[PDB]
Amino acid sequence: TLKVDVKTPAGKTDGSVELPAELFDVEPNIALMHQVVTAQLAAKRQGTHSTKTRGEVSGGGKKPYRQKGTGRARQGSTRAPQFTGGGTVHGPKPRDYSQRTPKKMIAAALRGALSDRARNDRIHAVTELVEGQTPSTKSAKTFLGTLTENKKVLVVIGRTDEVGAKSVRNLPGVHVISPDQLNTYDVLNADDVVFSVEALNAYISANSK
Amino acid sequence: MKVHKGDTVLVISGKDKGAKGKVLVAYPDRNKVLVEGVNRIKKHTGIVTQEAPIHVSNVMVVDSDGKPTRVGYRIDDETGKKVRIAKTNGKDI
RNA sequence: GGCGUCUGGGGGGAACGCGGGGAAGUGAAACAUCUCAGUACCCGUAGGAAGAGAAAACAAAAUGUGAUUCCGUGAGUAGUGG
RNA sequence: UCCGGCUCUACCUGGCUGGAGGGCAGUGAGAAAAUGUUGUGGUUAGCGGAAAUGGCUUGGGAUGGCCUGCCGUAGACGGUGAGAGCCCGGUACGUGAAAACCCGACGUCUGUCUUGAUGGUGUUCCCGAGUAGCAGCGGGCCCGUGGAAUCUGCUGUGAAUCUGCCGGGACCACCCGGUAAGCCUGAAUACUUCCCAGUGACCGAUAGCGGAUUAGUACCGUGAGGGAAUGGUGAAAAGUACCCCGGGAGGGGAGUGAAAGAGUACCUGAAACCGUGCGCUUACAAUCCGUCAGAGCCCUCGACGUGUCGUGGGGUGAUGGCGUGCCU
């Protein structure tokens, strides 16, 4: 049990949220997290790299010249790989890099990353990022400065919290994620993870149930 | 280009930064202007001296009170026209 | 058959569709059955998609499903084969 | 519902047919061609859009460094004289259509049911014909003719209408399923000549399309057809006025430029290859051309004097020893 006290943009404490042990107290597993984030980045990568083989390059259907009598090397096409302008032997072709990582591995890696953040009390909960109905980057920036002085932060707010997302959108170090889109890469990329109270409760409800 | 022939501008970058001048030729397809007394070269004809075009980003339109600004637009609702205004004081330029 | 008068057609187009015709190099360490392959190619025709489609169907004693199409399994299995 | 006209003719009874409500459907597979009004609905041009002329310093130039502010629903990406959120085009975010077209909607419009509906009783007729089935020869099904069902082409022969027919992998009996020889049918699916907006642990000029340059061009072939090579001055052309040698080309001064070791033979400018100058060596010598000793000469770094050693270093090497190129 670790306790997170909710802060409001007005600057006062609201309440507390109890972080369950099985979600924020697991022992981090470096190899597991490495595999998971590597698979993530492989799924991100698009393999739109291609080359033309010896048969896809233009022309070169006719045997060029005399095999014998010439005194020259015997060539079967003008598009053979040894020729300038000919095809590529083992060149890139379009491919998919995504891996079929098991669900338990992914969830455990996420839990390990979040537990590492919670061990060093880098987890924060807020009621709302700004006073509602109008985005304001100054107010959100000031509130984030009060919460933390680090460089890269992860903001986890609900999909309906449009005003907060727009408020923290333009800050260089801020990355905004939805509670059901939480992943190992984004957690491990962030020095601090600022949670929204509803988003935190939604994540706990989805997992601990 | 938000700056026109006959406008008076202040050079904000380059060799002649700080010099005021008058736009006498505008080149919309090049984003360049010709300004009096700035960016003068020495062409070998003897050797004569004349101005050369300067990128329109290096100059700024000066106000009535001689202060450079970004130029903005206000719509007149009476006639449907659209005039240039200064963003420093709001007055018409 | 002729005459007159109306309405259509003709040709082009990269891929995809449907219906017909249909190789050989190759593999089988030879080769003819077989494979390659109903591929390459060719012919006739479309449409924005086409084709199929409303049980003379499956099923197996379950008081069972309920037109067609497409996707995953069943499964490289049951089988089939100089 | 009501009214009207007919079922050979009139009278009293059962059916066919028009006209009024009432519905019910619609360009739909289920019949069709239209015609109006409307939807900040869409597409086909756009427009607006915050914040630094900030200070010092380097510099040809600040978009660099250090230090101050400011905007941010905008710190996407480019350009600008070198890494720019605040200089420009823009970006977030808002806004905009006379006309044409495309989607909707409501209508005129059209079709259509109301001469109608229900659940009951025992019998004749109908339920898709050169078809199904059968035979011969083929095709294709996991099935290559096999005991070979189901499906199908050509050639012969050729039925029944429901206690009829077909199927359940030869076939028969019994059960079960279905109702052939009539026709339409949307969605889920395939694709990209072309248009628009983007993306890349894709290429970066022998790469990437054959094609960044006259590219299916030049050129080759009678013809079908085959098929190249060629990108970079500079920030700006400011592209060298004028003088001199020279027929010119070219160059030397002089200027432009931050740079001409940027001069339209132009970024950088490697190797092969070709010169010029200096040092050492080489014309009695049998050399896989090096390697190990090595005199002499030249250069260089230290120490002491004047030249002479040193924990020295480099170039060349007379001379002696050894030594049969690489790959397959």
PDB file of all heavy atoms in Angstrom, chain D residues 276-287:
ATOM      1  P     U D 276      59.334  16.889 -66.559  1.00  0.00           P
ATOM      2  OP1   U D 276      60.116  17.169 -67.784  1.00  0.00           O
ATOM      3  OP2   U D 276      59.582  15.645 -65.798  1.00  0.00           O
ATOM      4  O5'   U D 276      59.514  18.123 -65.575  1.00  0.00           O
ATOM      5  C5'   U D 276      59.217  19.437 -66.011  1.00  0.00           C
ATOM      6  C4'   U D 276      59.206  20.415 -64.868  1.00  0.00           C
ATOM      7  O4'   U D 276      58.016  20.220 -64.067  1.00  0.00           O
ATOM      8  C3'   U D 276      60.348  20.287 -63.879  1.00  0.00           C
ATOM      9  O3'   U D 276      61.527  20.931 -64.322  1.00  0.00           O
ATOM     10  C2'   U D 276      59.765  20.892 -62.612  1.00  0.00           C
ATOM     11  O2'   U D 276      59.805  22.308 -62.675  1.00  0.00           O
ATOM     12  C1'   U D 276      58.307  20.452 -62.708  1.00  0.00           C
ATOM     13  N1    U D 276      58.026  19.209 -61.960  1.00  0.00           N
ATOM     14  C2    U D 276      57.911  19.269 -60.592  1.00  0.00           C
ATOM     15  O2    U D 276      58.061  20.293 -59.956  1.00  0.00           O
ATOM     16  N3    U D 276      57.630  18.080 -59.983  1.00  0.00           N
ATOM     17  C4    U D 276      57.451  16.862 -60.594  1.00  0.00           C
ATOM     18  O4    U D 276      57.194  15.869 -59.918  1.00  0.00           O
ATOM     19  C5    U D 276      57.572  16.882 -62.011  1.00  0.00           C
ATOM     20  C6    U D 276      57.841  18.029 -62.627  1.00  0.00           C
ATOM     21  P     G D 277      62.965  20.388 -63.867  1.00  0.00           P
ATOM     22  OP1   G D 277      63.994  21.116 -64.643  1.00  0.00           O
ATOM     23  OP2   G D 277      62.928  18.909 -63.905  1.00  0.00           O
ATOM     24  O5'   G D 277      63.083  20.840 -62.347  1.00  0.00           O
ATOM     25  C5'   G D 277      63.171  22.213 -62.001  1.00  0.00           C
ATOM     26  C4'   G D 277      63.041  22.420 -60.514  1.00  0.00           C
ATOM     27  O4'   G D 277      61.747  21.951 -60.067  1.00  0.00           O
ATOM     28  C3'   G D 277      64.030  21.664 -59.643  1.00  0.00           C
ATOM     29  O3'   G D 277      65.285  22.313 -59.547  1.00  0.00           O
ATOM     30  C2'   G D 277      63.298  21.568 -58.314  1.00  0.00           C
ATOM     31  O2'   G D 277      63.398  22.791 -57.603  1.00  0.00           O
ATOM     32  C1'   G D 277      61.853  21.405 -58.772  1.00  0.00           C
ATOM     33  N9    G D 277      61.421  19.997 -58.823  1.00  0.00           N
ATOM     34  C8    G D 277      61.194  19.249 -59.947  1.00  0.00           C
ATOM     35  N7    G D 277      60.799  18.037 -59.689  1.00  0.00           N
ATOM     36  C5    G D 277      60.758  17.986 -58.306  1.00  0.00           C
ATOM     37  C6    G D 277      60.401  16.926 -57.445  1.00  0.00           C
ATOM     38  O6    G D 277      60.039  15.787 -57.746  1.00  0.00           O
ATOM     39  N1    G D 277      60.501  17.296 -56.115  1.00  0.00           N
ATOM     40  C2    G D 277      60.885  18.529 -55.668  1.00  0.00           C
ATOM     41  N2    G D 277      60.922  18.711 -54.345  1.00  0.00           N
ATOM     42  N3    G D 277      61.219  19.527 -56.459  1.00  0.00           N
ATOM     43  C4    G D 277      61.135  19.185 -57.757  1.00  0.00           C
ATOM     44  P     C D 278      66.633  21.458 -59.387  1.00  0.00           P
ATOM     45  OP1   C D 278      67.778  22.386 -59.534  1.00  0.00           O
ATOM     46  OP2   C D 278      66.536  20.276 -60.274  1.00  0.00           O
ATOM     47  O5'   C D 278      66.603  20.958 -57.876  1.00  0.00           O
ATOM     48  C5'   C D 278      66.973  21.822 -56.814  1.00  0.00           C
ATOM     49  C4'   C D 278      66.643  21.227 -55.468  1.00  0.00           C
ATOM     50  O4'   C D 278      65.265  20.773 -55.455  1.00  0.00           O
ATOM     51  C3'   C D 278      67.431  19.993 -55.061  1.00  0.00           C
ATOM     52  O3'   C D 278      68.723  20.286 -54.564  1.00  0.00           O
ATOM     53  C2'   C D 278      66.518  19.353 -54.029  1.00  0.00           C
ATOM     54  O2'   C D 278      66.597  20.051 -52.796  1.00  0.00           O
ATOM     55  C1'   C D 278      65.147  19.623 -54.643  1.00  0.00           C
ATOM     56  N1    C D 278      64.689  18.496 -55.483  1.00  0.00           N
ATOM     57  C2    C D 278      64.190  17.352 -54.865  1.00  0.00           C
ATOM     58  O2    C D 278      64.146  17.315 -53.629  1.00  0.00           O
ATOM     59  N3    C D 278      63.771  16.322 -55.624  1.00  0.00           N
ATOM     60  C4    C D 278      63.839  16.408 -56.949  1.00  0.00           C
ATOM     61  N4    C D 278      63.414  15.374 -57.673  1.00  0.00           N
ATOM     62  C5    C D 278      64.342  17.560 -57.605  1.00  0.00           C
ATOM     63  C6    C D 278      64.749  18.572 -56.840  1.00  0.00           C
ATOM     64  P     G D 279      69.936  19.271 -54.839  1.00  0.00           P
ATOM     65  OP1   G D 279      71.202  19.957 -54.498  1.00  0.00           O
ATOM     66  OP2   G D 279      69.751  18.702 -56.194  1.00  0.00           O
ATOM     67  O5'   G D 279      69.714  18.101 -53.783  1.00  0.00           O
ATOM     68  C5'   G D 279      69.825  18.341 -52.389  1.00  0.00           C
ATOM     69  C4'   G D 279      69.490  17.107 -51.591  1.00  0.00           C
ATOM     70  O4'   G D 279      68.093  16.774 -51.773  1.00  0.00           O
ATOM     71  C3'   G D 279      70.230  15.842 -51.988  1.00  0.00           C
ATOM     72  O3'   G D 279      71.517  15.760 -51.406  1.00  0.00           O
ATOM     73  C2'   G D 279      69.287  14.740 -51.525  1.00  0.00           C
ATOM     74  O2'   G D 279      69.416  14.529 -50.129  1.00  0.00           O
ATOM     75  C1'   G D 279      67.925  15.375 -51.786  1.00  0.00           C
ATOM     76  N9    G D 279      67.348  14.992 -53.086  1.00  0.00           N
ATOM     77  C8    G D 279      67.276  15.792 -54.193  1.00  0.00           C
ATOM     78  N7    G D 279      66.698  15.216 -55.204  1.00  0.00           N
ATOM     79  C5    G D 279      66.357  13.962 -54.733  1.00  0.00           C
ATOM     80  C6    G D 279      65.700  12.894 -55.383  1.00  0.00           C
ATOM     81  O6    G D 279      65.282  12.848 -56.542  1.00  0.00           O
ATOM     82  N1    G D 279      65.550  11.799 -54.551  1.00  0.00           N
ATOM     83  C2    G D 279      65.973  11.740 -53.253  1.00  0.00           C
ATOM     84  N2    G D 279      65.745  10.602 -52.592  1.00  0.00           N
ATOM     85  N3    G D 279      66.586  12.731 -52.633  1.00  0.00           N
ATOM     86  C4    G D 279      66.743  13.806 -53.426  1.00  0.00           C
ATOM     87  P     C D 280      72.743  15.145 -52.236  1.00  0.00           P
ATOM     88  OP1   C D 280      73.991  15.455 -51.504  1.00  0.00           O
ATOM     89  OP2   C D 280      72.596  15.564 -53.645  1.00  0.00           O
ATOM     90  O5'   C D 280      72.513  13.572 -52.156  1.00  0.00           O
ATOM     91  C5'   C D 280      72.656  12.878 -50.927  1.00  0.00           C
ATOM     92  C4'   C D 280      72.101  11.480 -51.007  1.00  0.00           C
ATOM     93  O4'   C D 280      70.680  11.527 -51.293  1.00  0.00           O
ATOM     94  C3'   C D 280      72.658  10.596 -52.109  1.00  0.00           C
ATOM     95  O3'   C D 280      73.920  10.037 -51.807  1.00  0.00           O
ATOM     96  C2'   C D 280      71.561   9.560 -52.270  1.00  0.00           C
ATOM     97  O2'   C D 280      71.608   8.616 -51.211  1.00  0.00           O
ATOM     98  C1'   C D 280      70.315  10.419 -52.085  1.00  0.00           C
ATOM     99  N1    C D 280      69.789  10.908 -53.377  1.00  0.00           N
ATOM    100  C2    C D 280      69.055  10.037 -54.177  1.00  0.00           C
ATOM    101  O2    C D 280      68.871   8.883 -53.769  1.00  0.00           O
ATOM    102  N3    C D 280      68.567  10.470 -55.357  1.00  0.00           N
ATOM    103  C4    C D 280      68.801  11.721 -55.745  1.00  0.00           C
ATOM    104  N4    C D 280      68.308  12.118 -56.915  1.00  0.00           N
ATOM    105  C5    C D 280      69.546  12.628 -54.951  1.00  0.00           C
ATOM    106  C6    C D 280      70.017  12.184 -53.788  1.00  0.00           C
ATOM    107  P     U D 281      74.991   9.807 -52.978  1.00  0.00           P
ATOM    108  OP1   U D 281      76.254   9.349 -52.359  1.00  0.00           O
ATOM    109  OP2   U D 281      74.986  11.010 -53.841  1.00  0.00           O
ATOM    110  O5'   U D 281      74.389   8.606 -53.830  1.00  0.00           O
ATOM    111  C5'   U D 281      74.168   7.333 -53.245  1.00  0.00           C
ATOM    112  C4'   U D 281      73.297   6.465 -54.117  1.00  0.00           C
ATOM    113  O4'   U D 281      72.049   7.141 -54.401  1.00  0.00           O
ATOM    114  C3'   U D 281      73.852   6.135 -55.489  1.00  0.00           C
ATOM    115  O3'   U D 281      74.782   5.072 -55.456  1.00  0.00           O
ATOM    116  C2'   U D 281      72.599   5.809 -56.287  1.00  0.00           C
ATOM    117  O2'   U D 281      72.160   4.494 -55.998  1.00  0.00           O
ATOM    118  C1'   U D 281      71.593   6.786 -55.687  1.00  0.00           C
ATOM    119  N1    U D 281      71.416   8.015 -56.490  1.00  0.00           N
ATOM    120  C2    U D 281      70.620   7.944 -57.611  1.00  0.00           C
ATOM    121  O2    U D 281      70.084   6.921 -57.982  1.00  0.00           O
ATOM    122  N3    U D 281      70.479   9.117 -58.296  1.00  0.00           N
ATOM    123  C4    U D 281      71.037  10.331 -57.977  1.00  0.00           C
ATOM    124  O4    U D 281      70.816  11.301 -58.694  1.00  0.00           O
ATOM    125  C5    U D 281      71.839  10.329 -56.800  1.00  0.00           C
ATOM    126  C6    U D 281      71.994   9.198 -56.113  1.00  0.00           C
ATOM    127  P     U D 282      76.071   5.108 -56.404  1.00  0.00           P
ATOM    128  OP1   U D 282      77.047   4.127 -55.876  1.00  0.00           O
ATOM    129  OP2   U D 282      76.464   6.525 -56.575  1.00  0.00           O
ATOM    130  O5'   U D 282      75.535   4.575 -57.801  1.00  0.00           O
ATOM    131  C5'   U D 282      75.001   3.267 -57.926  1.00  0.00           C
ATOM    132  C4'   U D 282      74.174   3.132 -59.178  1.00  0.00           C
ATOM    133  O4'   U D 282      73.056   4.053 -59.125  1.00  0.00           O
ATOM    134  C3'   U D 282      74.874   3.481 -60.480  1.00  0.00           C
ATOM    135  O3'   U D 282      75.687   2.432 -60.973  1.00  0.00           O
ATOM    136  C2'   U D 282      73.710   3.834 -61.394  1.00  0.00           C
ATOM    137  O2'   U D 282      73.075   2.659 -61.870  1.00  0.00           O
ATOM    138  C1'   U D 282      72.762   4.529 -60.420  1.00  0.00           C
ATOM    139  N1    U D 282      72.933   5.998 -60.436  1.00  0.00           N
ATOM    140  C2    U D 282      72.271   6.691 -61.418  1.00  0.00           C
ATOM    141  O2    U D 282      71.571   6.143 -62.241  1.00  0.00           O
ATOM    142  N3    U D 282      72.458   8.044 -61.400  1.00  0.00           N
ATOM    143  C4    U D 282      73.231   8.759 -60.518  1.00  0.00           C
ATOM    144  O4    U D 282      73.300   9.979 -60.630  1.00  0.00           O
ATOM    145  C5    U D 282      73.887   7.971 -59.527  1.00  0.00           C
ATOM    146  C6    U D 282      73.720   6.649 -59.525  1.00  0.00           C
ATOM    147  P     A D 283      77.139   2.752 -61.581  1.00  0.00           P
ATOM    148  OP1   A D 283      78.028   1.603 -61.296  1.00  0.00           O
ATOM    149  OP2   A D 283      77.525   4.114 -61.147  1.00  0.00           O
ATOM    150  O5'   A D 283      76.903   2.792 -63.153  1.00  0.00           O
ATOM    151  C5'   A D 283      76.500   1.627 -63.851  1.00  0.00           C
ATOM    152  C4'   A D 283      76.740   1.751 -65.335  1.00  0.00           C
ATOM    153  O4'   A D 283      76.039   2.898 -65.858  1.00  0.00           O
ATOM    154  C3'   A D 283      78.177   1.964 -65.776  1.00  0.00           C
ATOM    155  O3'   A D 283      78.895   0.744 -65.833  1.00  0.00           O
ATOM    156  C2'   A D 283      78.023   2.616 -67.147  1.00  0.00           C
ATOM    157  O2'   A D 283      77.874   1.625 -68.151  1.00  0.00           O
ATOM    158  C1'   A D 283      76.694   3.369 -67.010  1.00  0.00           C
ATOM    159  N9    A D 283      76.847   4.833 -66.936  1.00  0.00           N
ATOM    160  C8    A D 283      77.283   5.623 -65.908  1.00  0.00           C
ATOM    161  N7    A D 283      77.279   6.902 -66.197  1.00  0.00           N
ATOM    162  C5    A D 283      76.805   6.953 -67.497  1.00  0.00           C
ATOM    163  C6    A D 283      76.564   8.012 -68.379  1.00  0.00           C
ATOM    164  N6    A D 283      76.776   9.289 -68.073  1.00  0.00           N
ATOM    165  N1    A D 283      76.093   7.721 -69.606  1.00  0.00           N
ATOM    166  C2    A D 283      75.880   6.441 -69.912  1.00  0.00           C
ATOM    167  N3    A D 283      76.069   5.358 -69.168  1.00  0.00           N
ATOM    168  C4    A D 283      76.538   5.689 -67.960  1.00  0.00           C
ATOM    169  P     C D 284      80.218   0.514 -64.957  1.00  0.00           P
ATOM    170  OP1   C D 284      79.886   0.759 -63.536  1.00  0.00           O
ATOM    171  OP2   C D 284      81.339   1.243 -65.592  1.00  0.00           O
ATOM    172  O5'   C D 284      80.516  -1.038 -65.128  1.00  0.00           O
ATOM    173  C5'   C D 284      79.506  -2.009 -64.879  1.00  0.00           C
ATOM    174  C4'   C D 284      80.076  -3.286 -64.312  1.00  0.00           C
ATOM    175  O4'   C D 284      80.614  -4.106 -65.384  1.00  0.00           O
ATOM    176  C3'   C D 284      81.209  -3.111 -63.302  1.00  0.00           C
ATOM    177  O3'   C D 284      81.115  -4.144 -62.325  1.00  0.00           O
ATOM    178  C2'   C D 284      82.449  -3.350 -64.153  1.00  0.00           C
ATOM    179  O2'   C D 284      83.585  -3.763 -63.426  1.00  0.00           O
ATOM    180  C1'   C D 284      81.954  -4.442 -65.088  1.00  0.00           C
ATOM    181  N1    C D 284      82.700  -4.572 -66.347  1.00  0.00           N
ATOM    182  C2    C D 284      83.849  -5.356 -66.348  1.00  0.00           C
ATOM    183  O2    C D 284      84.207  -5.887 -65.291  1.00  0.00           O
ATOM    184  N3    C D 284      84.549  -5.508 -67.489  1.00  0.00           N
ATOM    185  C4    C D 284      84.128  -4.919 -68.602  1.00  0.00           C
ATOM    186  N4    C D 284      84.850  -5.096 -69.706  1.00  0.00           N
ATOM    187  C5    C D 284      82.954  -4.122 -68.637  1.00  0.00           C
ATOM    188  C6    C D 284      82.272  -3.980 -67.496  1.00  0.00           C
ATOM    189  P     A D 285      80.551  -3.826 -60.859  1.00  0.00           P
ATOM    190  OP1   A D 285      80.775  -2.391 -60.577  1.00  0.00           O
ATOM    191  OP2   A D 285      81.077  -4.857 -59.937  1.00  0.00           O
ATOM    192  O5'   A D 285      78.990  -4.081 -60.990  1.00  0.00           O
ATOM    193  C5'   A D 285      78.492  -5.381 -61.249  1.00  0.00           C
ATOM    194  C4'   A D 285      77.167  -5.342 -61.963  1.00  0.00           C
ATOM    195  O4'   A D 285      77.334  -4.741 -63.267  1.00  0.00           O
ATOM    196  C3'   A D 285      76.543  -6.697 -62.245  1.00  0.00           C
ATOM    197  O3'   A D 285      75.800  -7.163 -61.137  1.00  0.00           O
ATOM    198  C2'   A D 285      75.689  -6.447 -63.482  1.00  0.00           C
ATOM    199  O2'   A D 285      74.423  -5.919 -63.120  1.00  0.00           O
ATOM    200  C1'   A D 285      76.480  -5.354 -64.203  1.00  0.00           C
ATOM    201  N9    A D 285      77.294  -5.851 -65.327  1.00  0.00           N
ATOM    202  C8    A D 285      77.034  -5.682 -66.658  1.00  0.00           C
ATOM    203  N7    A D 285      77.933  -6.206 -67.447  1.00  0.00           N
ATOM    204  C5    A D 285      78.856  -6.749 -66.574  1.00  0.00           C
ATOM    205  C6    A D 285      80.047  -7.450 -66.787  1.00  0.00           C
ATOM    206  N6    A D 285      80.532  -7.727 -67.992  1.00  0.00           N
ATOM    207  N1    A D 285      80.738  -7.860 -65.708  1.00  0.00           N
ATOM    208  C2    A D 285      80.248  -7.581 -64.500  1.00  0.00           C
ATOM    209  N3    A D 285      79.141  -6.931 -64.171  1.00  0.00           N
ATOM    210  C4    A D 285      78.477  -6.539 -65.266  1.00  0.00           C
ATOM    211  P     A D 286      75.737  -8.726 -60.796  1.00  0.00           P
ATOM    212  OP1   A D 286      75.240  -8.881 -59.410  1.00  0.00           O
ATOM    213  OP2   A D 286      77.011  -9.358 -61.209  1.00  0.00           O
ATOM    214  O5'   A D 286      74.598  -9.272 -61.752  1.00  0.00           O
ATOM    215  C5'   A D 286      74.081 -10.576 -61.562  1.00  0.00           C
ATOM    216  C4'   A D 286      72.737 -10.741 -62.211  1.00  0.00           C
ATOM    217  O4'   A D 286      72.869 -10.467 -63.631  1.00  0.00           O
ATOM    218  C3'   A D 286      72.160 -12.145 -62.092  1.00  0.00           C
ATOM    219  O3'   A D 286      70.744 -12.079 -61.949  1.00  0.00           O
ATOM    220  C2'   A D 286      72.533 -12.781 -63.425  1.00  0.00           C
ATOM    221  O2'   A D 286      71.690 -13.837 -63.829  1.00  0.00           O
ATOM    222  C1'   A D 286      72.458 -11.590 -64.378  1.00  0.00           C
ATOM    223  N9    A D 286      73.338 -11.730 -65.541  1.00  0.00           N
ATOM    224  C8    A D 286      74.595 -12.271 -65.565  1.00  0.00           C
ATOM    225  N7    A D 286      75.147 -12.305 -66.750  1.00  0.00           N
ATOM    226  C5    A D 286      74.180 -11.750 -67.568  1.00  0.00           C
ATOM    227  C6    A D 286      74.146 -11.498 -68.947  1.00  0.00           C
ATOM    228  N6    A D 286      75.145 -11.781 -69.778  1.00  0.00           N
ATOM    229  N1    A D 286      73.035 -10.938 -69.458  1.00  0.00           N
ATOM    230  C2    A D 286      72.029 -10.654 -68.631  1.00  0.00           C
ATOM    231  N3    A D 286      71.940 -10.844 -67.319  1.00  0.00           N
ATOM    232  C4    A D 286      73.061 -11.402 -66.842  1.00  0.00           C
ATOM    233  P     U D 287      70.070 -12.503 -60.554  1.00  0.00           P
ATOM    234  OP1   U D 287      71.033 -13.340 -59.802  1.00  0.00           O
ATOM    235  OP2   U D 287      68.721 -13.036 -60.855  1.00  0.00           O
ATOM    236  O5'   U D 287      69.910 -11.130 -59.767  1.00  0.00           O
ATOM    237  C5'   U D 287      69.360 -11.100 -58.453  1.00  0.00           C
ATOM    238  C4'   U D 287      68.172 -10.176 -58.364  1.00  0.00           C
ATOM    239  O4'   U D 287      68.582  -8.832 -58.737  1.00  0.00           O
ATOM    240  C3'   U D 287      67.005 -10.527 -59.280  1.00  0.00           C
ATOM    241  O3'   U D 287      65.781 -10.129 -58.663  1.00  0.00           O
ATOM    242  C2'   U D 287      67.265  -9.635 -60.486  1.00  0.00           C
ATOM    243  O2'   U D 287      66.139  -9.388 -61.298  1.00  0.00           O
ATOM    244  C1'   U D 287      67.776  -8.374 -59.803  1.00  0.00           C
ATOM    245  N1    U D 287      68.585  -7.499 -60.660  1.00  0.00           N
ATOM    246  C2    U D 287      68.796  -6.219 -60.204  1.00  0.00           C
ATOM    247  O2    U D 287      68.362  -5.826 -59.141  1.00  0.00           O
ATOM    248  N3    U D 287      69.546  -5.424 -61.026  1.00  0.00           N
ATOM    249  C4    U D 287      70.086  -5.771 -62.242  1.00  0.00           C
ATOM    250  O4    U D 287      70.741  -4.940 -62.867  1.00  0.00           O
ATOM    251  C5    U D 287      69.815  -7.111 -62.653  1.00  0.00           C
ATOM    252  C6    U D 287      69.088  -7.910 -61.868  1.00  0.00           C
TER     253        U D 287
END
